[PDB]
Design a protein around this ligand. Sequence first.
Ligand code: AL0
Ligand code: AL0
Ligand code: ZN
Ligand code: ZN
Lengths: 153, 153, 310, 310
Amino acid sequence: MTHDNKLQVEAIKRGTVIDHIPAQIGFKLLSLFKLTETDQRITIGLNLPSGEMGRKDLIKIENTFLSEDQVDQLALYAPQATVNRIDNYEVVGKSRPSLPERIDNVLVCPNSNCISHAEPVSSSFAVRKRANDIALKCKYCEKEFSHNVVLAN
Amino acid sequence: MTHDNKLQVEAIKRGTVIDHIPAQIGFKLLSLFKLTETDQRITIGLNLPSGEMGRKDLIKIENTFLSEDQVDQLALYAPQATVNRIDNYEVVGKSRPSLPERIDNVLVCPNSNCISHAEPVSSSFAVRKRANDIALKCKYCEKEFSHNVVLAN
Amino acid sequence: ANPLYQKHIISINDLSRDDLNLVLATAAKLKANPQPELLKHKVIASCFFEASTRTRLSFETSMHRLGASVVGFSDSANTSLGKKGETLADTISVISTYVDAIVMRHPQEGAARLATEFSGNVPVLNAGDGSNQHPTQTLLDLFTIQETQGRLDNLHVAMVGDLKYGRTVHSLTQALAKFDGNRFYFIAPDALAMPQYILDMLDEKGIAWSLHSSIEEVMAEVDILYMTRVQKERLDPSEYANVKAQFVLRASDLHNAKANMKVLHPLPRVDEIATDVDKTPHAWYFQQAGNGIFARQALLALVLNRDLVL
Amino acid sequence: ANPLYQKHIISINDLSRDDLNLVLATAAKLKANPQPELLKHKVIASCFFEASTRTRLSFETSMHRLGASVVGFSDSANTSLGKKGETLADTISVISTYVDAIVMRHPQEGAARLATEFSGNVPVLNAGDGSNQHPTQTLLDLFTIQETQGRLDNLHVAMVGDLKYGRTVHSLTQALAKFDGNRFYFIAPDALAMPQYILDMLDEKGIAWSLHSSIEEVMAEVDILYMTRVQKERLDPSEYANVKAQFVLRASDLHNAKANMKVLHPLPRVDEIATDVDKTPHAWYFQQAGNGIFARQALLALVLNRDLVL
Ligand SMILES: N[C@@H](CN(O)N=O)C(=O)O
Ligand SMILES: N[C@@H](CN(O)N=O)C(=O)O
Ligand SMILES: [Zn+2]
Ligand SMILES: [Zn+2]
């Protein structure tokens, strides 16, 4: 009596799967990108090892794939994160978040006098790379900050 | 070593697991109770098959237990949710969330003139069950509202 | 020491009948035999974040009558407190290292309770926190009723005016409901009637209460006529006039009043009690105000001096 | 028809070289031949959420000289302003249904750009938004330099004063950097020096610039001396005075100046340019202010009238 095949009704569905997310960031992405507000299931794995003396968070959502630009929105939080449109590995060649040249709706301008705070508008920042930093320029007040500032709100 | 598998979708071990969480209430608990501030592993599943006719959320967080005055804290959000201690079923009484006498740190007083808002204190409300309603009395302003009020605002 | 020693005095509800009795007992005693040196080497903070002259002068006078020293302010833009984002918490954490007791009045409802959590060992006496609690006002009212009626049980109490927002009468109604056999008469315009939660409480304790449209309707039965302030800003100017009707007291209305009845009023009465009443033997609002000294002296003595008075 | 017809004028940086030329060309044409009925049936809103009398009167005069009508408010705390309730968005969504154009001054950076997303095909002209942009101020500055020097390229520009916070000089520097062969001289106390991001831009384009401690170090080669206002509050009184030195201008300093030099200033010159300068032929700040009518008439003309003028 031998059950041959390897499977346990676990990893099977056409959805997307984001992995190798730095620890303590998975919950950040879920919140920051409101991904748990869909009606279709989600499998989440937090603090699940992978290899070296490193951390690891994982998020699995189904029946939905993230656009090219949507993937990039992870660049700032999940650097070199790996994704896999998974109907069964529909990942294109190599899909790892690239730095978007524009990031909206999640960041908060550090400038207290920016009109953006008390108003019904979505935040928007221009992205550019430097050395030891990433510059974000507010669409509204036009002030520029380093991501270290914008992220420590 | 005695643990026995590589399961990133549904496993077990010395950890607490909350059962039958209504849809869109699972992530809420993760935020409201900062259940991801753990270093210990966590496996969650959302919008998955329920009692043969609905949808539900599921939270499995390894190497950590819940208490009486904690599981209860789920009463106001996940009432009919079960909590099976799982060091390996070393659960005793029919562990189901009852209404706590006090609910702290999560609720926000609807009273805009309440001192609790601009100060370094924890919210705190007394609980009283009503017919078709639930009364929460703020420890600070001493004003009483219905959870329907406190959960909207 | 005495049951109230080193205890914070924040809400009337936190006070047991025993407590009320002890405070009122002490008040009578100090009234009979003043003790000007009781709190000699004590320094008290009179922190009026929200201005209120009479209550402030009454409170500070009490402190002096006991010999204590006083320091404080009236944050009504008279000080340099919490300019940008300086918390009440930090203010208390500071002031609580200077003084032996904090008497505070604040615009926000749970101010005094919050102060309690940052004042380590230093007692805080609530002089009023927004629309919530005002302990000493209730104590002075009860003391006045007891002194003029000889008891706090089995009385006929009428409360007129704005019973909906007057948190003064909510606190007094609840205080009296801790004693037996009292009957209440509530006179107020429909838009400012006693709240249902108060009536619910009276029902569950089986206390008798009835609603009336005019004072004259029960003037014959009342032992205490509690007149409340009706703020103009409340209703519409035309609304007010249309209702002020008789929720205003005039000497003429006292023709058939009980010899022992006393007319009380939280005080600012300009628009509720006609001066011709001031001459009658029933007017007791100034005496009532005068009693604030003894009730507040008693409270300070109790929390700052271990043994009972004498 | 024209490139700027129906466009929003929010940041000097959204303006291309050709745009600047077009605005300046139009300004000169309207200056040589007025067109009093060009905007005859137009109604424009002058919304100064932040009071600014000079630029407001300048803007409004421009409107009237083109024949347009004006409604508005300098809600400098004297309008039924949204009691810190109504959003700027809602204010604009309402106002954009009444008028044909919105000129607005606001305390917060980004205000004009935000208005842009709620106005309906109704153009918004930024009259200043906090410490961000003041498009028309740079335009009148540019226009005044062009008129007096005959060009905007190959000039020697000195900027004196507060280069750190004077955002009008930041904009003017970035605008002149859109022209070739310009030479800059920055004279300011070290605590108020030009920001490094500005110098980075100039190095990126190979524009020649240098720092100097006094105006008399460069008076000989300067074509344009742009004087900035230095608000004492930016420093402490003792500090201000200490640096005050020569960063102020007086007639004696212009002994070796070039015949063609013009001294400019945004205004509020009270503390920087001595009155004995007003008489010299170099003084041109009042003419500069007078050019605001033309540069702003030009913008209104371009955005609200399809076809070019003259
Ligand atoms: N306590 C009153 C003022 N008052 O009458 N003081 O005596 C208030 O703050 O409304
Ligand atoms: N300079 C003033 C406006 N004004 O009236 N100038 O003359 C401001 O920036 O508010
Ligand atoms: Zn901004
Ligand atoms: Zn509250």
